[PDB]
C-alpha cells in the first residue's frame, strides 16, 4: 500500500543478489521429502 | 547393553574442555604482559582480551553439548 | 529436539520480520 | 450510552452492547486506542522512569507461565491433597 | 537495629494506629447496624437491585467479597500446622 | 525432562511462533519530534555509536549495507536478551532460522564478488605471493574451506545458548536437591555468579556473528 | 489518615477465620487415618 | 508544531503497582486494606498447589535481583546523562 | 551391542576437538602483544588475526563431523 | 553391572580438569615476568591474574560438576 | 563383532589430529610478532609461514587417512 | 564383573597429573628469565613462584585423591 | 577375538602423532622470529630448523612403525 | 576376567607421564633465553632450572609408581 | 580372552611418548632465538640444549619400555 514506496529503491536496487533465496528453499524442501520418507518407512 | 555404552561414551566425550582452560589461561596471560608494556590503551587491550575469551568459551562449549545429547 | 521437520513457519516469520519490520522503524532516524 | 463501559448503568449493559458497533472498529481500532493510551501516559512524556517497561515484561512473564502449566502440575507437584 | 527503629516502632506506632481501628473484632453494639445493612440488601434482592447503577460501585463490592474470600484460606493453613 | 523448552514451537492449538518472533519490535519506536524523551534518545545515541565503529572501512559499495547490517545486529542481541527471562522462549535456539539466516547473505557475498570483479575474486583462492611449489596441494585446501562458513557461523550459535541454558536448569536442580539434605547456599552462589556471564555473553555473539559477515563482505567488495 | 471501616465487614472477616480454622481440622482429621492405609496397601 | 510533552507520567508503588488502585479502594479498605488483599492472594496461590515450586524458581529470584542490584545502583546516572545530549543540540541550533 | 559401539565410538571421537582451543588462545594472545609493540598496522593485523581464526577451526568441526557421521 | 559400568564412567571423565591445571600455571608465570620489567602497577596486575585464576578454575569445576552429575 | 572393533578403531585413532590446530596457531602468532618489527621484509615471512602450515596440515590429513582407512 | 569394571576408572583417573607437570615446568622458567631481567626483585619474585607452584600442585592431586578414594 | 585386540591396539597406537605436529608448529615460529630479529644469519638459523624438524619426524615414525607391528 | 581389568587399567595409568616430558623442555629452553641477554650470572640461573627439572620429574615418577603398584 | 587385554594395553601404552615430541621442539626452537642475540656465545648454549634434549628422550624411552614389559 504505501509502505511498498518507502523502501523501493532498496529492493530494486542493492537487494537484487541477496534475493536469491532459492538455495535455502531447495534445501529445505529436500531435507523435508527426505525427513517425510524416513517417517513414512517407519 | 546400551546403557553401560551411553555412560562411557558420554565419560570419555567430556574430556575435551582442556583446550579451552588452555586457551583462555593463554589469553589473559598475553593481556598482563601487553599492558604491562605501556599503562596506556588498557581499555582498547582489555576489549581484546575479552572478545579472546568469549570466542575460546565459544569454541570450546559445544563439547558437552554431545555428552548431554548421549544421556538423553 | 531441534530437529523435528516443521521448519517453514519459523522461516516465514523470520524473514517477514527482518526484511519489513526492523528495516522500517530503522530508517527513521537521523544523524 | 456512548459513555465509556466503567461509566454505563448495570441496567444498561444490554443497551451499550448496542452501543459497543465501532468499538472495535475492525477489531484493529480499539488494539489502535489501546497501545496508544499506555504508551502516551507512562512513556511519551518529559522524563519517565523504569515502570514504562517493568508492566510489559511482567505481562509477558504471566503470559508464559500461563501457557507451560500442563506439564508442570502434571508431575512437579509435591504432595497430594 | 536502626531499621527496627524506623519500621517496628512506626509499626506499633502509625501502622498500629492505621491497622488497630481498622483491624479488631466488632463491638456487639453493631450487629443490629448489619442486621439493618442485610435489610438494605434484601429492598433490592426483591426488586431494583442493580436499578442501573454504576459499574465501579459492583466492582469495589466484589474486591471487599474477595478479600472476604481469602480468610477461609488462611484458616485452613492455621489448622493444617 | 530437560529437553522440553527447546521441542516446544510454543504449543497451543494454533501456533504462536509468530506472535513470539515478532513481540521484540514492540520496544523500538520510531521518532517524530526533534526533541524527544529520554526512552529513543539513548537507543539513537547507541545506534549512532555502534554504526561508527563498524561500517568505516568499506569505500562505497559497502556503505549501502549499512541499513540491513545494524537491523540484523539489533535484532539478534534483542532476541537473545529478551530469552533470559524466567519461563521465555529463544527462538534462536532452533535450527531452522539459524539455517536460513546464514546462507542468503552469504550467497549473496559469493556471486555478488564473481559478477563484477571475476578475475581478482578468482585470484583469491590462490594465497598472495609465491607460496614455493606446494601450489595444488593448498589450492584444495581454502576452496574447501570457503564452504565451511556458513555451517559453523550457524552451528555456534546454536550450540552455545543451549549448553548455557542446561548449565542453569541443572544447577537450578541442584540447589533444590541439597535443601532437604543439608544446608549448602554454595549452589545459589554459583547460580548468581553465572547468571551475569550468561547475561553478558549473548552480545558477543551478537557482535561476532555480524563481524564475520562484515569482514566477509569486504573482501569481494 | 486512618479511616474506620464498615463494622458490618469487619465481623464477616473473623467469622470466616474461626469456620476456616474449624474445616481444616476436620478435614486433617478425616484425612490422616485414610492416607496411612492407602500406604499401607501400597506396600 | 506539536505541542510540549507533559512533565510527569504517573506514580506507581513497588515499581509495579500504580497509585490508581490504592485510591480505588481508599474508603472502604482503608489506608492498609489492600495489602492484606494481596498476601492473601500469595497465601492462597501457594497453599493449593497452583503455582509449583520447580527449579526455575531459583533461577528466576537470581535472574530478578540481578536487574534491581542494576537499576537501584545506576539508575539516575542514566537519567542525567540522556538530559545533557538534549541540553547539548539546543545549544548548538540556537548559536 | 552393534548401536552400543556406535556410540561408544561417537563419544570417544569427539575428544580431539581441544586442539582449536589452544590453537584459538595462541593466535590471540599474539596479537595483543603485537599490537602493543607497534600501535600503527591495525588492519594487517586484524587481517592476520582474522585469517589463523578461521584456518584453525577446520580441523576440530572436521572431527566433530566425523562423530557425528559414524554416530548415524 | 550397572554401578560397576558407572564407575569407570565416572572416573574417566574427571580428566578435563587436568587442563584447568595448565592456565593457571600459564598465568602466574606472565605475571612474574610481566611485573619484573615495570615493578610498579602491582595491584591492578594482581587482579587481572586473580581474574583469569577464577575464571580457569570454573571452567574446570565445569566438568567436574559433570562427573558429579555422571555417578547419581 | 568385528563391526565394533571397526567402530572403536576409528574412534580412537580420529584423536591424532589434534595437534594440527596446536601448530597451526603458533605459527599464526609467529607472523604476527614478527610482521611488527620489520614490516619491509613481509614478503619472505610468509613463505616460511605457509611451508609450515602446510607441513602440519599434511600430517593431520595422514592421521586422519589412517582412521578412514582402519573405519573400512 | 564388578571388580572387572573396577581399576579401569582408577587407571583413567590418573592421567590427570599431565596438566599439573606442565604447569609445574611453566612456572619455575618463567621465573628464571624474570629473574635474568631484573636481579633486584628477587624475594618477590621467588615468593610469588612459590604461591603459583602450590597453587597448581594442590590442584593437580585432587586426580590422585579421586583415584583413591574410587579404589577404596 | 584377536581382530578386536588388532583393532583396538592399532587404533590406540596411531594416536602418538600430536607432539610431531606441534613440535613442527614451534619450530617454524621461533625460525620467523629469529631472522626478523636478526638478519644475515640464516644459514645458521635454517640449519638448527631442519635438525629439529628431522628430530620430530622422527620420534613420529617410531610410533607409526609401532603401530605397524601391533597391526601385523 | 580381572586380569584383562589390571592390564588394560595398566595401560591407561602410563600416560601420565606425557605432562612431565613436556614440561622438561620448557624449563632447559627458557635457561638458553635467560643466560644469552646476561652471561656473567650464570652460576644462579642453574639452581632454579634444576629444583624444577627434579620437580617434574618426581611428578612423572608418581605416575609409574601407581601403574606398577595397579600391575602388581 | 587375556591376549585381546595384553593388546589393548600394549596399544594403549604408547600414547605417552607425545610429550617428548611436544618438548624437543621448543628446546630447539629456544636455540635458534637464544643464537639471535650474542651469536659467538654458541658453544656453552649447544650443550645446554643437548642435555635437555637427552633427558626429554630418556623420560619418553623410561614411558615406552613398559610396553614391551607387558607385551612380553
Partial sequence: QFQFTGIKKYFNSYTLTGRMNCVLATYGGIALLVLYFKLRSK | ?????????????????????????????????????????????????????????????????????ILF | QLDTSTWFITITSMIMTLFILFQLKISNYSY | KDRRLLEVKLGELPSWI??????????????????????????????????????VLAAYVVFNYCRSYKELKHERLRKYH | ???????????????????????????????????????????????????????????????????????????????RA | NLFASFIAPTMMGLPIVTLIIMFPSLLFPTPKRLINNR??????????????????????????????????????????????????????????????????????????????????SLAHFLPQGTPALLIPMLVIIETISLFIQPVALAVRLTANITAGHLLIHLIGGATLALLN?????????????????????????????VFTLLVSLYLHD | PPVQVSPLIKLGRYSALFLGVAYGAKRYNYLKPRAEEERRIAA | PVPPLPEHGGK????????????????????????????????????????????????????????????????????????????????????
Avoid at chain 5, 29 to 57: R, Y
Avoid at chain 6, 63 to 82: A, E, K
Avoid at chain 6, 187 to 198: A, D, H, K, Y
Fill in chain 2, 1 to 69: 547393553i546400551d546403557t553401560a555404552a551411553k555412560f562411557i561414551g558420554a565419560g570419555a566425550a567430556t574430556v575435551g574442555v582442556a583446550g579451552s582452560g588452555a586457551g583462555i589461561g593463554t589469553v589473559f596471560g598475553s593481556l598482563i604482559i601487553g599492558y604491562a608494556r605501556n599503562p596506556s590503551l588498557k581499555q582498547q587491550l582489555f576489549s581484546y582480551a575479552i572478545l579472546g575469551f568469549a570466542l575460546s568459551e565459544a569454541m570450546g562449549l559445544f563439547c558437552l553439548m554431545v555428552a548431554f545429547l
Fill in chain 4, 18 to 55: 448496542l452501543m459497543r458497533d465501532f468499538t472495535p472498529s475492525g477489531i484493529a481500532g480499539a488494539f489502535q486506542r489501546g497501545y496508544y493510551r499506555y504508551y502516551n501516559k507512562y512513556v511519551n512524556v518529559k522524563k519517565g522512569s523504569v515502570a514504562g517497561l517493568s508492566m
Fill in chain 8, 12 to 95: 506507581v508503588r513497588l515499581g509495579l503497582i500504580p497509585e490508581e488502585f490504592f485510591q480505588f479502594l481508599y474508603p472502604k479498605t482503608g489506608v492498609t486494606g489492600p495489602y492484606v488483599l494481596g498476601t492473601g492472594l500469595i497465601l492462597y496461590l501457594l497453599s493449593k498447589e497452583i503455582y509449583v515450586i520447580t527449579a526455575e524458581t531459583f533461577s528466576a529470584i537470581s535472574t530478578i535481583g540481578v536487574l534491581v542490584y542494576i537499576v537501584k545502583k545506576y539508575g539516575a546516572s542514566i537519567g542525567a546523562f540522556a538530559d545533557k545530549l538534549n541540553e547539548q543540540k539546543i545549544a548548538q541550533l540556537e548559536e
Fill in chain 5, 1 to 79: 537495629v536502626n531499621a527496627a527503629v524506623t519500621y517496628s516502632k512506626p509499626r506499633l506506632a502509625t501502622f498500629w494506629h492505621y491497622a488497630k481501628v481498622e483491624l479488631v473484632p466488632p463491638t456487639p453494639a453493631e450487629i443490629p447496624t448489619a442486621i439493618q445493612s442485610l435489610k438494605k440488601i434484601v429492598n433490592s434482592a426483591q426488586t431494583g437491585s442493580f436499578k442501573q447503577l454504576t459499574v465501579k460501585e459492583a466492582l469495589l463490592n466484589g474486591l471487599v467479597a474477595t478479600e472476604v474470600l481469602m480468610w477461609f484460606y488462611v484458616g485452613e493453613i492455621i489448622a
Fill in chain 6, 181 to 209: 539434605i543439608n544446608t549448602m547456599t554454595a549452589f545459589i552462589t554459583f547460580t548468581i555468579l553465572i547468571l551475569l556471564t550468561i547475561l553478558e555473553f549473548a552480545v558477543a555473539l551478537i557482535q561476532a556473528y
Fill in chain 6, 39 to 120: 526512552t529513543i534518545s539513548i537507543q539513537q545515541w547507541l545506534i549512532q555509536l555502534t554504526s561508527k565503529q563498524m561500517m568505516a572501512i568499506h569505500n562505497q559499495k559497502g556503505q549501502t549495507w549499512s541499513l540491513m547490517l545494524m537491523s540484523l545486529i539489533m535484532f539478534i542481541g534483542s532476541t537473545n536478551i529478551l530469552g533470559l527471562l524466567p519461563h521465555s522462549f529463544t527462538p534462536t535456539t532452533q535450527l531452522s532460522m539459524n539455517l536460513g539466516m546464514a546462507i542468503p547473505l552469504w550467497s549473496a557475498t559469493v556471486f555478488t564478488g564473481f559478477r563484477y570483479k571475476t578475475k581478482t
